[PDB]
Design a protein around this nucleic acid. Structure first.
Ligand SMILES: [K+]
Ligand SMILES: [K+]
Ligand SMILES: [K+]
Ligand SMILES: [K+]
Ligand SMILES: [K+]
Ligand SMILES: [K+]
Ligand SMILES: [K+]
Ligand SMILES: [K+]
Ligand SMILES: [Mg+2]
Ligand SMILES: [Mg+2]
Ligand SMILES: [Mg+2]
Ligand SMILES: [Mg+2]
Ligand SMILES: [Mg+2]
Ligand SMILES: [Mg+2]
Ligand SMILES: [Mg+2]
Ligand SMILES: [Mg+2]
Ligand SMILES: [Mg+2]
Ligand SMILES: [Mg+2]
Ligand SMILES: [Mg+2]
Ligand SMILES: [Mg+2]
Ligand SMILES: [Mg+2]
Ligand SMILES: [Mg+2]
Ligand SMILES: [Mg+2]
Ligand SMILES: [Mg+2]
Ligand SMILES: [Mg+2]
Ligand SMILES: [Mg+2]
Ligand SMILES: [Mg+2]
Ligand SMILES: [Mg+2]
Ligand SMILES: [Mg+2]
Ligand SMILES: [Mg+2]
Ligand SMILES: [Mg+2]
Ligand SMILES: [Mg+2]
Ligand SMILES: [Mg+2]
Ligand SMILES: [Mg+2]
Ligand SMILES: [Mg+2]
Ligand SMILES: [Mg+2]
Ligand SMILES: [Mg+2]
Ligand SMILES: [Mg+2]
Ligand SMILES: [Mg+2]
Ligand SMILES: [Mg+2]
Ligand SMILES: [Mg+2]
Ligand SMILES: [Mg+2]
Ligand SMILES: [Mg+2]
Ligand SMILES: [Mg+2]
Ligand SMILES: [Mg+2]
Ligand SMILES: [Mg+2]
Ligand SMILES: [Mg+2]
Lengths: 48, 117, 142, 103, 110, 56, 150
RNA sequence: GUAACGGGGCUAAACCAUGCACCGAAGCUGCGGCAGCGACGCGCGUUGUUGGGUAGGGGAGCGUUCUGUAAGCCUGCGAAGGUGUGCUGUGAGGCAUGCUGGAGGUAUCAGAAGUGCGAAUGCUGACAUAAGUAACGAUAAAGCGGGUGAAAAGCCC
RNA sequence: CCCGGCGAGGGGAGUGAAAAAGAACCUGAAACCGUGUACGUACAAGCAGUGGGAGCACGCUUAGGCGUGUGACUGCGUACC
């Protein structure tokens, strides 16, 4: 039990998505927004 | 936590430019052009591992045909004859024998002709 | 081991003499093209000229079937606008008979530097005499 | 003198003393391997042609080395379709030294 | 034994100076001096002063005889460019580069 | 009219293959003064074909 | 970013990429796209999870023989040399010392020894229990930690 | 511009019929290797099977800066950075070492992100290209002697 | 001290651990521009590579091939977003 031998539980710390960081990521370019239209836009989307 | 990109960016560009050695003009000097050249070289290399197998078999066949016809039989009859004789020597080896051991090649032809007889 | 390749320095090329008299143009030309390329040798290598030197005699007596003697047309363009020129087979035989065989063989050889090098080994003559006694050509019946 | 044998789904023409690179054999280094499926043995003008294998034909070899071949890069790229994939490859081999050919 | 002289920041484009440098590369120094004397180029004046400096350096500092010296190496590198503004028609400004050159001459007996 | 593609350093060098200067073939030697000079021109010390044509 | 809201050049006709602000994050000297603000990084720890963690730590110190219980731990005077002598006597270098009542003499003696720290039982924290090589607790301190967690 | 077999050429090298050979793909098989999923038995085996992919969903990682671990560890007997070379992994990468450099670097396991660029007529700087090309700004105009000077069409007389 | 115009600039000498720390000064990348050397290239048609491959040069530990550079000739092949 030292400050460099403590680990989180398995499955407790999932890494966040990072969009727009290249092809291999699977979220490159359009960042999961698809192509064009209102929902692709910054601030884009219709009200509830 | 500001991150400067220069050290990593340099290493990535240099990796590509090292693979573009020998290419003409901007293709060995300029990252944007070298990157495209290296990708295309990789695409061709992938394709040509398949093509190499086709080109060598084509070469072996042409040589077997020449050697068979020097011994009085066509390639197509020679191969049929070997199959009927249960000879399993492949075309790489037959073409090698055709160049390096003409007496042995002649013996294969006589075996093929006997199976067709 | 790697597959054998012929080496331009070590390739042996023999000399042959063929008589075109009465031979069908295209059926002669395929055998010439085959042997100029070296397709008849086990050492055949696509990037190497492994073929033989071939003298063709009596090019003016080469035969063609059907109505080709009058109706086969050779076209060429001079590069000048409107400069499309033509000659019938019979006109070609009368004026430049060696060209009939040379044209036929050239079209059956590979295109590119090596194909042009292969063509240089063909020596076509209109009559029954050549000047290559020194090369000691063997008779070849095509 | 030479012989032809099958190993690693490929065929090989070998003489005594030659080192030949084969697909990986599951056999320890510095140990003997016998190839008893010999397709041809030629000792000059004397030619034994297997139909398919030579009767009594055996090639003995010693395993000299195992190793991995030169790295090959696999590049896949679909232009305009936002797709690229790369992979490396090194193929295992076994080098054997031919010690004897006989029938 | 090699001796160097340089003219750094010489007022001429390297392209112009290289035309003259190419005349004397590999020549005996006395022949090089004659060639430069009858070359009608500004760069010939610049190169000749560097060659004369190299010879004087070789004689004074390195104990050479002029008679044995050749122009073993000569090259012109690009120096810093001075940037200037040239007014063109219709209120447009162009950049003028006043190019400079670094002239190096190496003389040797060997 | 202007280029659609940047010409190469190779093509630049090829165009400049005719730009090389030519050295004076040989200098003449005045018979009297022994001075080198351009042929058919006076020497630096004002000699021409052995005659002091120009003082200083 | 300090500067004017003037459009740097007209929308159309110049042959340049369109510009709106000299302060654009695309531009040198421009804003930071997602500029930081001061943040509070503190997390909630459920009281029971805090206490559960301390019990796990203390139990592990006992298992690893890192918890040393004593009756008394005192120095006569606020002299660093005395505490240094006491710790080398007990064969300790890097040590957390937990007492019932935090005395001035021991606190003052410990200050200039960077490997030594001296707490009262109320001032225990999870990191310090883990970080120090040994933990020395007075019998008094053990009772107070006993009561705090129980 | 032949220009309505891809060409040569072909009277079959055309067409019809029948047959047997052969060539021919990244298909199938062989040999070696990797990975996903499901069975069947003990994280390993055996067995079956799968692995082209845009939008897009899911899973698993590399590396960068910073905090702890670290008053530790490496480092003037040479840190970071730069530049080569060799080795190495399925990849992002990793390791070693020559030269340069001359004072820093930082394992491990965790923690946090200004965390990865080729494009945005992106932004700043540097440097190319066209090119030694156009041009040298009123077509009122110069010539020569002497002087000075390292040098004079342009300065002085 | 020496060349140069009592220049610019440079070569020595000297200082310094170092001057390729010389003030145009720590490190000193890339684009871009040169000099030198090896190989190729003046009958040859196209995304300039890739697969095959001779020759030449230079290394190297079986005297063997091997390595490094180059790349005649040849199959395939219309950049990227
Ligand atoms: K989405
Ligand atoms: K401002
Ligand atoms: K303390
Ligand atoms: K270093
Ligand atoms: K750390
Ligand atoms: K850009
Ligand atoms: K230029
Ligand atoms: K090629
Ligand atoms: Mg996708
Ligand atoms: Mg879009
Ligand atoms: Mg749409
Ligand atoms: Mg949509
Ligand atoms: Mg908006
Ligand atoms: Mg920072
Ligand atoms: Mg380079
Ligand atoms: Mg073709
Ligand atoms: Mg104005
Ligand atoms: Mg265009
Ligand atoms: Mg010119
Ligand atoms: Mg700012
Ligand atoms: Mg509370
Ligand atoms: Mg017409
Ligand atoms: Mg067709
Ligand atoms: Mg296949
Ligand atoms: Mg398959
Ligand atoms: Mg599949
Ligand atoms: Mg897939
Ligand atoms: Mg740290
Ligand atoms: Mg960023
Ligand atoms: Mg960039
Ligand atoms: Mg992009
Ligand atoms: Mg410009
Ligand atoms: Mg022009
Ligand atoms: Mg002009
Ligand atoms: Mg003009
Ligand atoms: Mg004027
Ligand atoms: Mg005057
Ligand atoms: Mg002056
Ligand atoms: Mg005037
Ligand atoms: Mg000075
Ligand atoms: Mg240095
Ligand atoms: Mg310093
Ligand atoms: Mg510096
Ligand atoms: Mg040539
Ligand atoms: Mg020609
Ligand atoms: Mg061309
Ligand atoms: Mg092609």
């Amino acid at each position: 039990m030292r400050l460099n031998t403590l680990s989180p539980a398995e499955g407790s710390k999932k890494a966040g998505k990072r969009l727009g960081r290249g092809i291999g990521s699977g979220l490159g370019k359009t960042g999961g927004r698809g192509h064009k239209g209102q929902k692709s836009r910054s601030g884009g989307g219709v009200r509830r | 936590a500001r991150v400067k990109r220069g050290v990593i960016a340099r290493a990535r560009h240099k990796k590509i430019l090292k693979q573009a050695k020998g290419y003409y003009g901007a293709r060995s000097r300029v990252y944007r052009v070298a990157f495209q050249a290296v990708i295309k070289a990789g695409q061709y290399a992938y394709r040509d591992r398949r093509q190499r197998k086709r080109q060598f078999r084509q070469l072996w066949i042409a040589r077997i045909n020449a050697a068979a016809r020097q011994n009085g039989i066509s390639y197509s009859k020679f191969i049929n004859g070997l199959k009927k004789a249960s000879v399993e020597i492949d075309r790489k080896i037959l073409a090698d024998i055709a160049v390096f051991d003409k007496v042995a090649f002649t013996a294969l032809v006589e075996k093929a002709k006997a199976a067709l007889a | 081991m790697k597959t054998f390749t012929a080496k331009p320095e070590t390739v042996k090329r023999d000399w042959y003499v063929v008589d075109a008299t009465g031979k069908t143009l295209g059926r002669l030309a395929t055998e010439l093209a085959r042997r100029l390329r070296g397709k008849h040798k086990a050492e055949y290598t696509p990037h190497v000229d492994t073929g033989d030197y071939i003298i063709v005699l009596n090019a003016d007596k080469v035969a063609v079937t059907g109505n080709k003697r009058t109706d086969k047309v050779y076209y060429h363009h001079t590069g000048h606008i409107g400069g499309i020129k033509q000659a019938t087979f019979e006109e070609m035989i009368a004026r430049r008979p060696e060209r009939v065989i040379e044209i036929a063989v050239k079209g059956m050889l590979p295109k590119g530097p090596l194909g042009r090098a292969m063509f240089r080994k063909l020596k076509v003559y209109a009559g029954n005499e050549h000047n290559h006694a020194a090369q000691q050509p063997q008779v070849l019946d095509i | 003198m030479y012989a032809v044998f099958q190993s690693g789904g490929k065929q090989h023409r070998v003489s005594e003393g030659q080192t030949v690179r084969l697909e990986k054999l599951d056999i320890a280094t510095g140990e003997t391997v016998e190839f008893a499926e010999v397709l041809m043995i030629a000792n000059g003008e004397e030619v034994k042609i297997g139909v398919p294998f030579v009767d009594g034909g055996v090639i003995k070899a010693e395993v000299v080395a195992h190793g991995r071949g030169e790295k090959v890069k696999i590049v896949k790229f679909r232009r305009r379709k936002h797709y690229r994939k790369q992979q490396g490859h090194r193929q295992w081999f076994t080098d054997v030294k031919i010690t004897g050919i006989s029938a | 034994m090699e001796t160097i002289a340089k003219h750094r920041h010489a007022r001429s484009s390297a392209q112009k100076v290289r035309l003259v440098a190419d005349l004397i590369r590999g020549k005996k120094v006395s022949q090089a001096l004659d060639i430069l004397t009858y070359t009608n180029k500004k760069a010939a004046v610049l190169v000749k002063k560097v060659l004369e400096s190299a010879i004087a350096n070789a004689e004074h500092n390195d104990g050479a005889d002029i008679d044995d010296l050749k122009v073993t190496k000569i090259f012109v590198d690009e120096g810093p460019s001075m940037k200037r503004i040239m007014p063109r028609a219709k209120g447009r400004a162009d950049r003028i580069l006043k190019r400079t050159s670094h002239i190096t001459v190496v003389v040797s007996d060997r | 009219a202007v280029q659609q593609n940047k010409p190469t350093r190779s093509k630049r060098g090829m165009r400049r293959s005719h730009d090389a200067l030519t050295a004076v073939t040989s200098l003449s030697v005045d018979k009297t003064s022994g001075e080198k000079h351009l042929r058919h021109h006076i020497t630096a010390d004002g000699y021409y074909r052995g005659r002091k044509v120009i003082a200083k | 970013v300090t500067g004017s809201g003037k459009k740097p050049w007209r929308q159309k006709g110049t042959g340049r990429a369109r510009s709106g602000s000299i302060k654009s994050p695309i531009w040198r000297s421009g804003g930071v796209t997602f500029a930081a603000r001061p943040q509070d990084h503190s997390q909630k720890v459920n009281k029971k999870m805090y206490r559960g963690a301390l019990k796990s730590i203390l139990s592990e110190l006992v298992r690893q023989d890192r918890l040393i219980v004593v009756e008394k731990f005192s120095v006569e005077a606020p002299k660093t040399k005395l505490l240094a002598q006491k710790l080398k006597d007990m064969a300790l270098e890097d040590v957390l010392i937990i007492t019932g009542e935090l005395d001035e003499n021991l606190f003052l003696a410990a200050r200039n020894l960077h490997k030594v720290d001296v707490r009262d039982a109320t001032g225990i924290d999870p990191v310090s229990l883990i970080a120090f090589d040994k933990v020395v607790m007075t019998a008094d301190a053990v009772k107070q930690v006993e009561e705090m967690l129980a």
